[PDB]
Structures are given as structure tokens and as C-alpha cells.
Amino acid sequence: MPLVYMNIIMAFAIALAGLLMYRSHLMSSLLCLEGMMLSLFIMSTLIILNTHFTLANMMPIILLVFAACEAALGLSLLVMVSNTYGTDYVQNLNLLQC
Amino acid sequence: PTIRLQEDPDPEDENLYEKNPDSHGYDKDPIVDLWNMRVVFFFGFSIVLVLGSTFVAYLPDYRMQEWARREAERLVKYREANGLPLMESNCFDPNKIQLPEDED
Amino acid sequence: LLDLIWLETILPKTTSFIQMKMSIMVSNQKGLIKLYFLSFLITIMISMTLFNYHE
Amino acid sequence: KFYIREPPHGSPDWLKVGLTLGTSVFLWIYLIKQHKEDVLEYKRRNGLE
Amino acid sequence: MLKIIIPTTMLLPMTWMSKHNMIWINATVHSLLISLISLSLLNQLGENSLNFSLTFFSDSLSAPLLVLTTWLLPLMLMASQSHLSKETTTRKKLYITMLILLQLFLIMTFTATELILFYILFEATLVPTLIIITRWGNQTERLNAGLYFLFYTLAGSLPLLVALVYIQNTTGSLNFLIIHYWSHPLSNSWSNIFMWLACIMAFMVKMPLYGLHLWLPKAHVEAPIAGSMVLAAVLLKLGGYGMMRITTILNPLTNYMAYPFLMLSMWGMIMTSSICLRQTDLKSLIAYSSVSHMALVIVAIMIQTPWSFMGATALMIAHGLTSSMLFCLANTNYERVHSRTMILARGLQTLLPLMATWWLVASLTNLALPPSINLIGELFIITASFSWSNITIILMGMNMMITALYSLYMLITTQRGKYTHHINNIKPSFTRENALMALHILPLLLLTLNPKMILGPLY
Amino acid sequence: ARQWQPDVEWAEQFGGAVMYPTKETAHWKPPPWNDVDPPKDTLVSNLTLNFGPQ
Amino acid sequence: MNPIIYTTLIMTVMSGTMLVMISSHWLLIWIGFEMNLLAMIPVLMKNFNPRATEAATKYFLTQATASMMLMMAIIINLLYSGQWTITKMFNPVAMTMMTMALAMKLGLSPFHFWVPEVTQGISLQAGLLLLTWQKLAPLSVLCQISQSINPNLMLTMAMLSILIGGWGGLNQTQLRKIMAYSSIAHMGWMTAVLPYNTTMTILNLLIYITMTLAMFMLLIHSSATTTLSLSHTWNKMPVITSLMMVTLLSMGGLPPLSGFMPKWMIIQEMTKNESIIMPTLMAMTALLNLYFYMRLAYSSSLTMFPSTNNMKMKWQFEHTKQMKLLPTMIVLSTLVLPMTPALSSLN
Amino acid sequence: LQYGPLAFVLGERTTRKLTETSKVITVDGNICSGKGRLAREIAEKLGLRHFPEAGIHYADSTTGDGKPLDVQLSGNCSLEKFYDDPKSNDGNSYRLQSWLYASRLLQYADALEHLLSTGQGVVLERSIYSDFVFLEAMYRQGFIRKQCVEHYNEVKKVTACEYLPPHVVVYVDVPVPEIQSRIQKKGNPHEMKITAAYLQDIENAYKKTFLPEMSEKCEVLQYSAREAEDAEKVVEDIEYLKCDKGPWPDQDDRTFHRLRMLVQNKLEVLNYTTIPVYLPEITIGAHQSDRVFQKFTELPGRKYSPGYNEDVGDKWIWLK
Amino acid sequence: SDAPPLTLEAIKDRVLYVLKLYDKIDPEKLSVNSHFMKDLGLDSLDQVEIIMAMEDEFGFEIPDIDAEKLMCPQEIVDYIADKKDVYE
Ligand SMILES: CCCCCCCCCCCCCCCCC[C@@H](O)O[C@H](CO[C@H](O)CCCCCCCCCCCCCCC)COP(=O)(O)OCC[N+](C)(C)C
Ligand SMILES: CCCCCCCCCCCCCCCCC[C@@H](O)O[C@H](CO[C@H](O)CCCCCCCCCCCCCCC)COP(=O)(O)OCC[N+](C)(C)C
Ligand SMILES: CCCCCCCCCCCC(=O)SCCNC(=O)CCNC(=O)[C@H](O)C(C)(C)COP(=O)(O)O
Ligand SMILES: Nc1ncnc2c1ncn2[C@@H]1O[C@H](COP(=O)(O)OP(=O)(O)O)[C@@H](O)[C@H]1O
């Protein structure tokens, strides 16, 4: 693979790692989710352009659509959590245990 | 209330002899109890015990004890007269056995 | 000494003690997504190297 | 006797009862017919009779 | 042999369709008739077994066990109807349903031609027993007793399942006739050693082997009387039956894998007999008696001789009858005085003479007075062990002396002495209890009259 | 004279949030009877603004 | 919530699952997962309260992470072989990531923390849906790529799931958490036999779904979510407690009940390979699930717990809503072992 | 057809049946005051359905036949012995209070179901919102413990929050000495032992908690004793209320759908009354529970479901 | 687990520490029986500050009545114990 492929894969890994380790704000983790979506878009677009697969040029648009759906879902859940606690801290979501 | 719960008291045990001086210990109802006694006695002692013991005593000899005794008598008679040994150490004829060629 | 104590001690009481201790260890989590998402990260990293690097 | 309607009345719901019985009889006759045709087809294919 | 299976399955709806006041009568009558029908299975051959179908067969080892099961059902019914008088009709029918299901599973277990079917039935016998113990027991220890009974059994039985499916994948069949005819020796390897252990430990825990028996005093003391009867008389013999069946494929590995179990059996026989000498609970004494007798049965099965197999069969039948009778005898006193402590009610021979006679006969058969079948089995096993090694007579000899001691200790403590002054509610013996004791004891002596019916296939 | 049945003391073993309580989980509370926690008074302060004089 | 909207959301959940099950393109499978999650999130919050909101948030975060890893694995597979068809998965790193993503979606151990929490935070109907219908899509995808699967990772996660399910279930008094740990252990059993025979996976899935439906419907019938509230059901409907006791016995795996059949067949299949140690450990561990099922049976059916005065008023009224499939579910959960050879129709 | 989601999907809507006379009315007052007569007159004048005050055997009146059952199988508490021995060591007081709260909850559910099904108004004597005055009077007099009060508060918190409060609250005010005079004039030998402090506690609870907190949900119509016999004046006073302040105007079709699904299914209504809080006053042992349940199942029309008891003359059972 | 089971002794050491942290009281002259008004020469306003310091230290509020009558450290310790139901 070229260097650009490794760079995009590294960006995906960094965004995943970012999502895995929570600080305080929920919104930061949502941003990491969007970052993973962007990295996947870039990687798929590069692969499809390189191989000249004409009918596959439309998949990244579908990916963006479902990324938007996912982001809207997350934002709605954040609105509800904030309305409950007045803060979007993940520390407050501790009513249910294992 | 200094209590912990609402519960019935533990009742005393009933004596079946109080309402039925000849009670047989099967039921509180005298008629049902008497017939329970009767069916238990008839179907346990009269039917299963005695008749089953007779049936087992007169079972036909499927174990073939007497057949084996008569066969052994025939064999002993035949072998004694001929001068043959009463019994043989090998129960299988060696002509039908093939030992391995080499023992070294 | 034997029937009421040691035969009890070795087979059933040891089993009960071990199962209860492991149940306490496994089931007592605070329910904070931070901790077990960090656990997920550790699992993912171990998995690529331990089982993925060897194909 | 009852304080209220208790909608299932002394007579049974005749529509539901008829539908249930009709479904049962239809399924039974369908199964009998299917088994008969299956036997005939099996006998024809292997040439028993 | 559906002519026996189907009538029990008919006992089920007969019980559930009977009037509220005729359930005991109907169940008892038809159980006795089913026992009479099963009596026909004693007509066995000298060379092979009765092969009814592809699924069921009857040997000379399982026919007396089936007869014992079918005979034990009516006795349990008579023993249960006293303390279940205040119970509702539905719960009484459920109790009878549990007993009938247990009999059906036991009947199918002793005649299954395959080992996996035998496993499924021998494991299905657990659910009715556990339900009976944990639902109709008297004290709060019954829950723990049920847990002990369940897990001790399953922890032994699951490796047996693994070993059985492995054996079927290896040899292509689990049918017992094919297994016997196509038998091949077991080599000396760790895989074979663990296969032996997996095939043996479930039956060992069922006997139960000394050191693996802790479940038995709990389960047999905390159960209701019918539960105790069927646990001591039939359910312990599943281990012996299964072990004599499975040992066909374990040779010649048994020749040395039997040593730890033999030492455990002999020494723990001595230990359990000694434990019987200092026991405050009358039922626990009978339970530990069962453990000692079953240790003898384990020794007989492990040394693998025709005389030991004959002795094992005879001892299993005799012990079933004797231990069931002893449990019923103890339950009579418990129902009178509501306590299991042995030294509470004393001098009972003065108050209940005929029950004292029943006690004497039961404790005489427990110590194996000749020519009872108890002694026939014990003596055959002792002779086989002596041929195995001349030093076993010492351990065997000690056991005989100890068994007599604790049996007569039980008799003298309960029947002789002076009656306790404060207990004034000792009513005369009912006809039902006397009939129960007679139906226990008369078949024992009748079988003594014709002992080849309980001596197994090696006869 | 009668079969033993569980009482209040026996029944209270199963009334906690967890079995086998420890020092850490002895302060865990069982969920409310309906799954509705009481609402917190997380008051959101309104914004205060100077409209004038300039 | 409007009944029409609820029905539309349920059909969208099922449409996402069916799209996963009928697609040949990896993109369509990923789309099915996205649609399923999008429709599932509001169903968890149907009865709005902070616990339901927390459960929905945790579920969304876990499943969104899982779908992100799923898409990355698909893209890596495309990079190393320009194939979109769901097949043997020509790349090993992509297969490892795919396995981890599907395990996260199913709730297999190590990623099993979310299941007890989401199940306890939602209603019994939402729990029924989550623990029955939501297993179909990841299991179907796993079945379609079973040949390229690495046994060492899948078997490790399956054994960990069985162990953790038993140990976690041992400690619970809440019925929903008990169900969740039971689900974790059964998922472990399902995935243990997947590399060897997918028919056994399907059979175990069907039997587990039947038993779970029966248990959840019995719990909804007698409105109990805690052990102590279930201990009152004997004084109101004893038949329900008896049927629940028999179903709990079936869940434990005791013969001659139907629950025993999947474990039996999986053990046989694993011994048809070499694989001797793993089934032995799996059975020994399932004994723990049997233990806490038996404890529940002790508390609800085999002993009678004290009741309250106000139960007398409840005695006068009947259950209005009736579940039409509950008797069939109970019968299928209990008395189906003699029909075992019918599993041949599954392949 | 049984009301449910299918009935709501096509057709049935509650908001159309409300015809300006829905107006859930409750007429509160102290002991022996003539609140029942006023409630009956209000119902007759306005054309609403009258609900007499729920007693110990209210639930019996609505299931099976309307005839009451034995107190052992229903209630398990006595009003008379509460007056005779208010400090009995068997928990009669709080058991009676808890049973009466459950009966009031059932009656409120019945009234709400009738109103939401027909659109017709209902008049109640007391409500679940008023039941606490008797509990406070018992606690201040030392007739019940504090744990009983905590249990009552838990049950009320999880039950009374799911319904809509009454549109208008009518209160009849009668002074305590006049109440004692009326009780003496009545003749019942058990009510004579009611101390004046008990009535004073009931009045304080009413006027200092119930009316203040109820006035925020909707305006309260108070009346002295003399201006309560004139029923037409009270009714015409009710007809000129501006009711746009409470939760009732903010109810749309879906909330009414949820409430209508809740008011039927009385098992769902009574769910939280039997919570496993083990108070000695209301906890019943397993043996007694089993005995009483077996006794109840043997009643002539109680073993099976309503239409399936052939021992009270149910026919065609084997086709139902 | 939560905080240890606070006892009378620890309450006394905390009260005495807070009191000697007050710049208007000399440490050596202060005892658990010293009276703020006479022994320590403290005015009514000073007492209010001491009570507020106790409030901060023990994390709970003392009403105007109640707190007003505590004139020496022993009464403060007794009040804190009675409010916290501490017997040891
Ligand atoms: C209360 C008062 C008591 C004392 C008074 C009693 C008066 C005297 C009566 C006592 C009788 C004395 C016994 C002496 C023995 C005589 C009987 C003997 O000769 O019969 C035996 C026969 O006995 C029977 O075979 C044994 C009975 C079978 C026992 C089965 C029990 C029935 C089932 C009950 C339930 C099963 C539970 C146990 C499960 C295994 C001989 O066997 P066999 O050598 O062949 O016969 C040769 C000739 N044949 C073959 C042509 C017949
Ligand atoms: C409390 C009651 C429980 C029930 C009792 C169950 C009884 C189980 C006992 C098992 C009997 C024998 C098992 C194995 C057979 C031989 C044992 C071994 O010690 O013998 C030597 C084995 O040598 C050494 O001992 C090696 C084994 C050492 C490791 C074993 C661990 C034993 C420690 C005790 C742990 C307790 C076990 C029971 C747990 C409760 C023989 O030498 P070798 O010829 O080379 O091995 C024969 C096999 N070959 C032919 C394939 C080579
Ligand atoms: C940051 C800068 C802000 C500063 C601005 C603060 C504004 C100050 C507001 C002033 C309020 C008053 O005058 S309030 C009125 C004050 N005067 C009285 O109360 C008359 C009786 N005097 C006394 O009781 C004692 O002298 C007394 C000193 C009180 C001790 O009290 P004790 O004997 O009981 O200890
Ligand atoms: N919730 C309650 N708690 C205790 N006693 C009550 C309760 N409700 C009614 N009562 C009693 O019922 C009796 C009459 O009830 P009431 O409605 O006030 O008189 P009336 O029959 O004229 O309407 C009184 O003795 C009253 O104390």
C-alpha cells in the first residue's frame, strides 16, 4: 500500500481510540464517531477511484446518509440526557449496573 | 404489634380413632376407609402374593437345567464306555486354529 | 472430623466458595461506560496481536 | 347472576365456533387428500402398481 | 414390553380423572395389578436375553429390579396417604403423578437397549425426585438437600455423556448387544484412563462411593417417606446396574484402576458402620447403613467375578426391601411423636408389641441372618473377595461384627427399656401400617425360598 | 405438626439489590417499584443581561 | 406513543433484519444493521424515564461502535480483493475485525457489559425483543462466513461468554439481569459450535428463542420484575408458577426436557471432531445457570412465601389481555425432545 | 370489541365525546357531614353518574354478583373494632386504611373508565387525593406506626401519579362540636367513642394540606353547613367555573388513549398495592394465605372465569 | 464502603481543631469546658462565626435556635453527636 492508505487507516484507529476513552463530555465521543465515518468515507473513495470501479462511486454517498442518521440519533439522545441532568457528562449514566 | 406477620396457629393432630373406634387408618370416611382396607388386602395378599408365588414356583424350565443334566449324562455315558477322557482341556479343535508361523 | 468437616470442606464447600467469589468479582461493576469501553480497547488490541498476528 | 354483561353470554359465539370447526374440517380433508395423492405418486414413480 | 409401560401411562389419567375420594384406592389397585403383570418377566433364558424389540430388552439382571420397582409403587402409595390427608385434591394428584412418572422412568431405564437412551432416562429420574423432596419435605433443610442431591449427581453424569458420545463416534454403536459382541481391550494410556474415569464416576456417585456420599444422608433424611423409600430401594441400584453394564468395555484397564475405589469401599464401609454407632437421628442411621451395604456392592462389581456379580444382584434386591421397611418403621414413630431423635420414645415394645415384632424382623434381616438373601449376597461377595485376596476377610469380618452391633443398638434403644413418662399420645398401630410392614417382609422370605430369581445373569 | 414455609426473615434475603453483599455493594439500592427515579432539581440558571443604559 | 408509529418502528426493525438476511452485498448488510438500530432506539424508550434513556444511550453507543468496525472490516476486505459479495473474507485482519464487531453486536464476552444494563433499564416487552429478535442478524452473518472464521478467537469468546454468564447470573435478584446473563451464556453455546456445524447453531438459536419467549411472556402475565414480587404469584395464579418452574427446569438443560437437546447435539458434534475438553468444560459451567434457575424455582414455585392483605382484592379480577401463543411456547419449550431427528430439516 | 390499539387506529377518539359536562367532581368533608346528600343532588341536577363512597366491600360490589363476601375473604379489617380498640396489637387500623386506599383507587379507576368510555360526568364522595387525612389523623393520635405511614406514602406515590385529578373539589365545612352533636344524635354505639381530637386532626389535615394543594390544580368550592342544603344554588355555582388551569385542558388523544388503557385492566391498576414491603400489620403468613385462598376458590361463582361456572347456571361451556 | 463510623472522640478532636484554628482564641487556654462568653472573652458575634465554622467542618446546618445556646465545646460535641445519633 502507499503512504496515504496507512495515514487514513491511522486516522481511523485514532478516532476509534478516541471514542473508546471517555473524558467527561458525551459530545466529544459523538465527534469521534463522526471522525470515524469521515475516515471510512475517504478510504472507500480512494480505493474506488484507484480501481476505476464505476458503479461503486455511489456507495460513499450512502455511507454519508447513514452517518447523518447516526449523528441525528446521537444528538437526540444527548438532548434527552442533558434535559434529565442539566449536563452531558457520562458520569451521570450510572443508574444501571452489571 | 410486637409481631412479625399474621399466621394461623399450628393445629393439633387429629386422632382417626376418635370419630371411628375401628378406623383402619386409611381414611376419615369409614366406608371409603373400609373399602381401602379391603382392596389393599385382597389385591396384595390374595392376588399378587399367593398367586404370583405359585406362578413363579411353576415357571417352565427355560434356563435348561434339566436339559443340560440329561445332555451331560449322555456325554458321560458315551465317553466312559469308549475309554475317552471325560473332559478335554481345549474346547476348540486345533485343526481349525492357525497359530502364527514364527515364534522367534 | 471426616464426614461433617473435611469431606464437606474439600468437595462442596470449596466449590461454593469459589463460585461465590467469582460471582462477586464478575457481577460487581459500577455501570460506567468509561471503564468497560477502556476494557473494550484492551480486548481489541490484544485480539489483533494474540490471535490476528498468527494466521 | 353477574353484576355486569360478562360479554361471553350463555350461548357461545356462533361465528367463532363455526369458523374454528370449519378450519379444522378443511385442514383434515386437505391432509387426507394430500396423503392420498402422495401415495399415488410414490406408487407411480417407483412402479409398484 | 409395552404391556407394562402403557398401563402406567394409563395410571396417569386414571388418577387425574378419579373422584376426589377414590384416588388412593384406584392408584393402589391398579399399581398392584401392574406389579402382577410385571411378575411375568422372571421367565428368563440361560444363554441370551429377552429381546422384545429394537428399543427394549429384558435380562436376568433387570427383571428383578423392574419387579421391585412395580412392587414398590403401591407400598409408597399406602405410606403416603397418612401424612397427606390435609392436602388439597390437586396437590395429592400431583404427588401421585410424580410417583407414577418416577416409576415410568425407572421401568424404561432398566430395559433400554442403548446407552444414550439409558442415560436420558437415568437422568430424567432426577426431576420427580427433586420435586418430591423440595416440595413435600417437612423442614427447611430440604432445599439444601435437593441442591446436594442434584449437583452431586450431575457433576458425575455429564462426563459420562461426553464419553458416551465419543464412544459412539469411535465404534459406531451404543447398542448393548453390539457393544458386548464387538468388545475390544483398552490400552494403558492417559486417554483411556480418563475415558474409564468418565464412564465410572457417575455410577460411583450414584451408589454412592465413600467420600462422595455426603448428599445421601441429607436427601434421605429430608425427604418424605415415599421419597426415602424410592431413594433407598431403587435409585441407588441404578449405579450398580449401570456399572455392571458399562464394565464390559473397560477391560483390562479395570485390573488396576479399581484399586482406589476398592480401598475406599472397604475402609469407608468400616467408617460408615462405625458412624452408625453414634447417631442421634434414627433416619440418618438407616442412611449410613445403606452406604455400608452399597460399599460392599461396589467391591463386588469392581472385582469382576461371577460369584461377585451374583452376590451384588442378591444384595441389591435384599437391601432395597430391608431399607424400605426400616424407613417405614421409623416413619411410624415419627408420625406418632413428631421427632426423629432416637432416645425420645423408648420402651415401645410395651405399648406396640406387633410393631416391635416387625422391628425385630427388619433388624434381623439388616444384620444378614441366614438363610436370608441378605446373607446369601453378603457371603457370595465375601467368598469372591477372599479369592481376590485372603486379607479382605479381616475388613469384611470387622464389618459383620459392627453391623450386628448397630442394628441391635437401634432395636434395643427404640423397643426396650422403659417408656418415656411424658409421651401419652402413642395410639395403637393402624391396620395400614401393619399391612405395609407385612408386604415389605413376606416377599423377602418368599425369595429366600427360591433364590435363583435374584442371582443375576451369571447364575 | 406442619411443613416449614418461608417467613419474613427468610424472604428478606432476596430483597436486596444483589445477592452475596459486600462492603462496596452494601450501599447499592434496589430500583424503585416502578422504574421511575425521582426527578433531580437540576435547575438551569437563566441568562442575566444588562439592556442599557448604553 | 402512537400505535401506528409503534407498528411502523417494529416493521422497520424487522425490515432491517430481513435486509441483513437476504442481501448478497456487504453494503446492503451494513445498511440493514443501520436501519435496525435506528428503528430499535425509540422502542427502548417507549416508556420514558431516566433509566430507559440511559439504556438507550448505552445501546446506541455500543452498536454504533460495532457498526463502525464492521464497515472498516468490509473496506479492508474490498481493498485486498475487490469483492463486495459476502464470502470467505479473503483477508485475515479484516476477518478478525469483523468477528470482533459481530461479537460486540451480539454481546459475547469480553464485550458483554451492555446487555445486563440495557435489559434492566427497559421494559419486559423491549427486553423480549432485544433478547430474541436482535440475535438473528449477527448470527446469520456469522453463519455465512463460518468457513473463514478463526476457531481460536471464536471459541475463546464462547467459553468466556459461558463462564461470565454463569458467574454473573449467580449474583442477581433482578429478573431482567438474570435473563440477560442467561442470554450471554446461551450466545456462548451458540457460537461454540459455529465453526463446526451451522445447523446446530440454528437449532440452539430456535430452542433458546422459544424458551426465552415463554419465560418473558410468563413474566409479563404475572407482573413481576424482582424475585420478591415473583414470590407472590403463587397466591394469585399457581398454574403460572408451576409452568414457570417447568420452563426454568428446561432452561437448565435437564433431560427429558427440550432444553437438553441443543447441548446434547453440540457435544456430539464437537466430539465428532477431536474437541473433547471444551464440551466437558461447557457442561460443567452450565451447571451454574442451572443453579440460579433452581434458586428462582425455589423462591417462586416449590415454597410459599408470605403475602400481603391487598392480594385479596386482586383475587376478584381476571387478566384482561391474553397472549395467544403462550401455551404453544410452553409446550415447545418443554415436551419436544422426542422429535429431535426433525432437526435434519434445518439444513 | 375490546378497546385497544386497533380501536384507536381506526375511529375511536376520546376527545370528541367530552361535552363540557365531563367534569369529574368530588365532594369532600369531615365525618358525619352531609356530603353524600350534596353529591347525590349535584349528580341528579347535572345529570352525572353518582358513586357512593367506597367501603370495605366496594370491590365485591363490582365482580361476580354485587353481593358482599365474608370479611375474612375480603377486607380482613373492621371499621367497628377500629373505633372500639384503635390501638389494637393486631394491626387492624393500618390494615383498614390500606384496604380503603386500594378500594378508593379501584373506584377512581372505575369512574375514569366510565367517563372516558361514555363522556358522562361522575360524582365521587372522596378520592385517593383525600384518603390521607384519615392516615394523618391516625398517626397523630398514635393509632399507627411511622413505618405504616412510609408504606402508605410509597404506595400513593407509585399509584396516584398516573391519573388526572378531579375537575372541581367541593368541600362541606362543619365545626367539630356540631359533628359530635350529630354523631350523638345518630345512635351508632361505635361512633360515640370517636374522640374530638380525632375529628380535629381530620379537619386540620383537610384545611391545611388537602385544600391548599388542591387549589393549585383547580379552584375549590367551599361551603358552610347551612349553604349546603340548597343544592340548586351549589349546582348553579358549579356551572360558572373557568376550568383552564389544570392538567385536564392539556390532554390530547394519545394521553387519553394511555389513560383509557390503564383504567380498564384493574390488575394493572392494583399492581403496586401489593408491593413486597413486609409490615407486620399487612403481612400474611404462607399457611394462612393458602388456607384463605383455598376458601375463596370454593365460593359458588369464583372457581373459574365468569362465563365458565356451571354451578351458578352457566350453559354451553363446552363451546365457549 | 462509606466513611468510617464516626465516634465521640473524633468529633471532639475536630471541634477542638476548628476552635484553635480561630485567631481570637489562644490554644493553650482553651479546654473542652471553656465557656466562650466568660473564659474565652468572646462576644455574641464571635460565637456566630464559631458556629458557622462548625457548620463548615461537619457539613450540616444548625438553626438560629439550637446553635445559639451552645456556649462551650462540650455542648457542641453533644449536639453533633445527638444530631448524628453517635453513641460511641
Ligand atoms: C402368622 C403365622 C405364621 C406361622 C404359621 C405358618 C404355617 C405354615 C406356613 C409356612 C410355609 C413353610 C415354608 C416351607 C417351604 C414349602 C414351599 C416350597 O416347597 O415351595 C418352593 C417354591 O417357592 C417359590 O418358588 C418361591 C416364591 C416366589 C417369591 C416371589 C414373590 C412374589 C412377588 C411379590 C413382590 C416382589 C418383590 C421383590 C422383587 C424382586 C419350592 O421351590 P421349587 O424347588 O422350585 O419346587 C420344586 C417343584 N416345582 C418346581 C414343580 C414347583
Ligand atoms: C474423595 C473421593 C473422590 C473419588 C476417588 C476417585 C479416584 C481417582 C484416582 C485415579 C486412579 C489412578 C489414576 C491414574 C493411574 C495411575 C496413577 C499414577 O500415579 O501411576 C503412575 C503414574 O506416574 C506418575 O504418578 C505420573 C502422575 C503424576 C501426576 C498425577 C497427579 C496426582 C496427585 C494427587 C491429586 C488428587 C487427585 C484426585 C482429586 C480429588 C504409573 O506410572 P506410569 O507408567 O508413568 O503411568 C501409567 C500411564 N501410562 C502407561 C500411559 C504411562
Ligand atoms: C464588603 C463590604 C460590605 C459591608 C456592608 C455591610 C452592611 C451592614 C448592615 C448593618 C445592619 C445593622 O445595623 S443591624 C442592628 C444592630 N444593632 C442592634 O441590634 C442593637 C443591639 N446591640 C447588640 O445587641 C450588640 O451590640 C451586638 C453588636 C448586636 C452583638 O450582639 P450580642 O450582644 O447578642 O452578642
Ligand atoms: N378513609 C376512611 N378511614 C377511616 N374511616 C372512614 C374512612 N372513610 C369513611 N370512614 C368512616 O365511615 C363513617 C361514615 O362515613 P361518612 O362518609 O363521613 O358519613 P356519611 O355516611 O354521612 O357520608 C364514619 O364513621 C367515617 O369515619
Automatic annotation (TrEMBL), chain C:
<comment type="similarity">
    <text>Belongs to the complex I subunit 5 family.</text>
</comment>
<protein>
    <recommendedName>
        <fullName>NADH-ubiquinone oxidoreductase chain 5</fullName>
    </recommendedName>
</protein>
<comment type="function">
    <text>Core subunit of the mitochondrial membrane respiratory chain NADH dehydrogenase (Complex I) which catalyzes electron transfer from NADH through the respiratory chain, using ubiquinone as an electron acceptor. Essential for the catalytic activity and assembly of complex I.</text>
</comment>
<feature type="transmembrane region" description="Helical">
    <location>
        <begin position="31"/>
        <end position="53"/>
    </location>
</feature>
Automatic annotation (TrEMBL), chain D:
<keyword id="KW-0249">Electron transport</keyword>
<keyword id="KW-0809">Transit peptide</keyword>
<keyword id="KW-0496">Mitochondrion</keyword>
<dbReference type="GO" id="GO:0045271">
    <property type="term" value="C:respiratory chain complex I"/>
</dbReference>
<protein>
    <recommendedName>
        <fullName>NADH dehydrogenase [ubiquinone] 1 subunit C1, mitochondrial</fullName>
    </recommendedName>
</protein>
<keyword id="KW-0812">Transmembrane</keyword>
<keyword id="KW-0472">Membrane</keyword>
<comment type="similarity">
    <text>Belongs to the complex I NDUFC1 subunit family.</text>
</comment>
<keyword id="KW-0813">Transport</keyword>
<keyword id="KW-0999">Mitochondrion inner membrane</keyword>
<comment type="subunit">
    <text>Complex I is composed of 45 different subunits.</text>
</comment>
<comment type="function">
    <text>Accessory subunit of the mitochondrial membrane respiratory chain NADH dehydrogenase (Complex I), that is believed not to be involved in catalysis. Complex I functions in the transfer of electrons from NADH to the respiratory chain. The immediate electron acceptor for the enzyme is believed to be ubiquinone.</text>
</comment>
UniProtKB/TrEMBL annotation, chain F:
<protein>
    <recommendedName>
        <fullName>NADH dehydrogenase [ubiquinone] iron-sulfur protein 2, mitochondrial</fullName>
    </recommendedName>
</protein>
<comment type="similarity">
    <text>Belongs to the complex I 49 kDa subunit family.</text>
</comment>
<comment type="subunit">
    <text>Core subunit of respiratory chain NADH dehydrogenase (Complex I) which is composed of 45 different subunits. Component of the iron-sulfur (IP) fragment of the enzyme. Interacts with NDUFAF3. Interacts with NDUFAF7. Interacts with CERS2.</text>
</comment>
TrEMBL record, chain H:
<feature type="binding site">
    <location>
        <position position="33"/>
    </location>
    <ligand>
        <name>GTP 1</name>
    </ligand>
</feature>
<feature type="binding site">
    <location>
        <position position="134"/>
    </location>
    <ligand>
        <name>GTP 2</name>
    </ligand>
</feature>
<feature type="binding site">
    <location>
        <position position="191"/>
    </location>
    <ligand>
        <name>GTP 3</name>
    </ligand>
</feature>
<feature type="binding site">
    <location>
        <position position="34"/>
    </location>
    <ligand>
        <name>GTP 3</name>
    </ligand>
</feature>
<feature type="binding site">
    <location>
        <position position="30"/>
    </location>
    <ligand>
        <name>Mg(2+) 1</name>
    </ligand>
</feature>
<keyword id="KW-0274">FAD</keyword>
<keyword id="KW-0547">Nucleotide-binding</keyword>
<feature type="binding site">
    <location>
        <position position="97"/>
    </location>
    <ligand>
        <name>GTP 2</name>
    </ligand>
</feature>
<feature type="disulfide bond">
    <location>
        <begin position="218"/>
        <end position="243"/>
    </location>
</feature>
<feature type="binding site">
    <location>
        <position position="97"/>
    </location>
    <ligand>
        <name>GTP 4</name>
    </ligand>
</feature>
<feature type="binding site">
    <location>
        <position position="34"/>
    </location>
    <ligand>
        <name>GTP 4</name>
    </ligand>
</feature>
<feature type="binding site">
    <location>
        <position position="126"/>
    </location>
    <ligand>
        <name>GTP 2</name>
    </ligand>
</feature>
